Amino acid sequence: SLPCDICKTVVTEAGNLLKDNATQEEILHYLEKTCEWIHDSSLSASCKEVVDSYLPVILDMIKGEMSNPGEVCSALNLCQ
Amino acid sequence: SLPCDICKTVVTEAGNLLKDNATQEEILHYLEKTCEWIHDSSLSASCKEVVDSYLPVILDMIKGEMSNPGEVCSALNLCQ
Amino acid sequence: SLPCDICKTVVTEAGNLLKDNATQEEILHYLEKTCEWIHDSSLSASCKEVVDSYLPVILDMIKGEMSNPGEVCSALNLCQ
Amino acid sequence: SLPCDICKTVVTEAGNLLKDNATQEEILHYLEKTCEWIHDSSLSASCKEVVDSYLPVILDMIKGEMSNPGEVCSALNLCQ
């Protein structure tokens, strides 16, 4: 069905952007820069450690949730 | 930037949703059913007359949108 | 849980915006002006009759559904 | 006009969502639990210390990028 096939396609491209290693690093380097919004050299360092450590895990979580589009658009009742 | 293909694709596939002659019938029948929520036999007819006449005009006007990404995807976060 | 708490809050606050009578006329004048897009003195008059009669009903129906966020976010299944 | 009035309304209420002190704590408690997605008493604690400290900073930019929808919706081609 067309609203299911489009939703599946959109979800597929969201997967393709999150797998893009340049996009993976853009968010990483962005949240690294976010840490510098507080001058604290110890907290900005600890922030960079947390960001660098958790974001690849979080991206893996979203990639694992963006896989199998049929199960995503179904949980949107856009599919059967 | 690459996410501009997303803005292009989402708009393009949504365009194919409105351009789908079958989807044009799906949206019509829901707004037709909306007319029957009032028992007035004169108003239910007049609503169907307005819906059958105006909705294709509304779809075509909105079809006039989403046609060219240059005036919609331009100057936002996904292409600039 | 947060995905439920956000959904409930968004639907509840958007509902109260739709209950704010200023929002009703904002939408109303668009559909009233929409009636002038077909040069039909009987249908453009009838269009306002359909718009002025059905839009307050439809807004009240949607306002009536957004009054209970529990049944709306359940229609997103995010609270289960 | 509705494409401008929608952006003005959405940005204003989206701002009001982040301004809600219940939403302010809910985002923390989700990200606090997010730190527990890595079973580490040393790193998850350092994450919780970072989360409680930086989340108010993140809200400030987004609130600041919502303290006037008219100047943002205009630079998105949505108003003028």
Query: Residue D47: which of A34, A37, A54 has the nearest Cβ?
Result: A54
Answer whether A6 sits within 8 Å of B23, measured CB to CB.
Answer: no
Structural method: X-ray
Are the beta carbons of A46 and D49 separated by less than 8 Å? yes
d(C-alpha D24, C-alpha C63), whole Å: 26
Rounded Cα distance, D51 and D35, in Å: 8
Residue with tokens 């006037």: D68
How far the first Cα of chain D sits from its last, in Å, is 10
DSSP class of residue A76? Answer: T
Q: How many CB atoms neighbour CB B69 within 10 A?
A: 19
Question: Of the candidates D43, D46, D53, which has its C-beta nearest A38's C-beta?
Answer: D53
Give the distance between the most distant pair of CA atoms in chain B: 55
Nearest CA in chain B to A3: B17
**D19 close to C (CB below 8 A):** no
Test the B interface: residue of C32, C47, C65 with most B CBs within 10 Å: C47
How close C24 comes to chain D (CA, Å)? Answer: 12
- Which are the contacts of B51, defined by CB distance < 8 A and separation ≥ 6? B28, B31, B32, B34, B35
Resolution in Å, one decimal, please: 3.2
**Do D23 and C13 lie within an 8 Å CB cutoff?**
no
Q: Where are the alpha helices (DSSP H) in chain D?
A: 2-19, 21-35, 41-64, 69-74
Determine the 3-state secondary structure of B40 from DSSP. coil
In the numeric block, the tokens 């809050």 are attached to: C9
Residue type, D34: T
In eight-state DSSP terms, residue A64 is: H
**Using CB atoms and an 8 Å cut-off, which of residues 39-78 of chain B contact chain A?**
none
B33-44 core/surface letters (b: 16 or more CB in 10 A; e: else): ebbeeeeeeebe
Place of tokens 């820069």: A33
Contact predicate C69/C7, CB 8 Å = yes
Q: How far is B42 from chain D (nearest CA, A)?
A: 31
Measure C57 CA to nearest chain B CA, in Å. Answer: 9
* Residue C43, token pair as written in the block: 């249908």
Q: Which helix (H) or strand (E) is B74 found in, with range? A: none
For residue A49, give the nearest of A31, A23, A69 by alpha carbon: A31
Contact C48, C35 (CB under 8 A): yes
Domain ranges across chain B = 1-80
Burial class (CB in 10 A: 0-12, 13-18, 19+), A41: exposed
Structure tokens, A35: 């840490």
Cβ pair C14:D13 closer than 8 A: yes
Sequential DSSP letters for C23-76: HHHHHHHHHHHHGGGS--HHHHHHHHHHHHHHHHHHHHHHHHHHT-HHHHHTTT
Q: Tell me how far apart the alpha carbons of residues D21 and D26 are, in angstroms, rounded to a whole number.
A: 8
Residue C18 to residue C60: CA distance in whole angstroms: 9
In angstroms, the CA B63 to CA A69 distance is 27
Q: Measured between alpha carbons, how far is residue B36 from residues B40, B45, B49, C55, C65 in Å?
A: 8, 9, 12, 14, 19
Chosen from C4, C8, C26, C27 to mutate, greatest number of chain D CBs within 10 A:
C26
